[PDB]
Amino acid sequence: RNLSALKRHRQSLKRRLRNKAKKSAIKTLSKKAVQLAQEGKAEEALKIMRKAESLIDKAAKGSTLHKNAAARRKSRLMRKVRQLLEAAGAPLIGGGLSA
């Protein structure tokens, strides 16, 4: 018995926790921006959105998001933030949205 495929398993768990972690952050900061924007705080909302954008791309840097999975998140994020700010806002900090 004993096959050193056990190694791939060990390795997968380290990878699992790593991916799992990055994502948690993404969702947390995303919801964060979607919140401040919803409260019309353009300045610090875009601020955070930028961090979320950054984390998303970096996640797709390796094999956590990759492909167009990253692109959706970003899209969905810039969309909600920009719309929610359509409630008296004016992109103050002019983060990642392009006037």
Partner RNA sequence: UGGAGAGUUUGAUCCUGGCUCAGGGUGAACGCUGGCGGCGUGCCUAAGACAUGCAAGUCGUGCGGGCCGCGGGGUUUUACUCCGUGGUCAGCGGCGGACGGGUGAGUAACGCGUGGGUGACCUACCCGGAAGAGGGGGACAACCCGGGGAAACUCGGGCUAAUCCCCCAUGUGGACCCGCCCCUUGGGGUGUGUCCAAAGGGCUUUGCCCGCUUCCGGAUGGGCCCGCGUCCCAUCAGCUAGUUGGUGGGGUAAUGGCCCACCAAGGCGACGACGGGUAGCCGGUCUGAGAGGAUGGCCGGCCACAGGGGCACUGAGACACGGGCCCCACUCCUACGGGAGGCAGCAGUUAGGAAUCUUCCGCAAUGGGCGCAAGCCUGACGGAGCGACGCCGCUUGGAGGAAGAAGCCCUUCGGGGUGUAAACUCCUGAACCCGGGACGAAACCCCCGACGAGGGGACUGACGGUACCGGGGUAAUAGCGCCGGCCAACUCCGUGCCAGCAGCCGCGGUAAUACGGAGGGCGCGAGCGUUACCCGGAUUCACUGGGCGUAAAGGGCGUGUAGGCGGCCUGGGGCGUCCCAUGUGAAAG
Among 28, 54, 75, 83, binds Mg ion (CB under 5 A): 28
- 28 makes contact, choosing from RNA, Mg ion, none, with CB < 5 to 8 Å by partner type, with Mg ion
Q: Please state the separation of Cα 19 from the chain's center in Å.
A: 12
Question: Does residue 44 belong to the site contacting RNA (CB under 7 A)?
Answer: no
Distance of CA 71 to the CA centre of its chain: 10
Query: Does the footprint of RNA cover residue 69 (CB under 7 A)?
Result: yes
> Of how many residues is the chain composed?
99
CA distance readout (Å), 71 to 6, 53, 60, 96 = 34, 9, 9, 14
Q: Which residues sit at the interface with RNA, rule CB under 7 A?
A: 1, 3-16, 18-20, 22, 50, 53-54, 56-58, 61-64, 66-72, 74-79, 82, 94-99
Q: Which residues sit at the interface with Mg ion, rule CB under 5 A?
A: 28
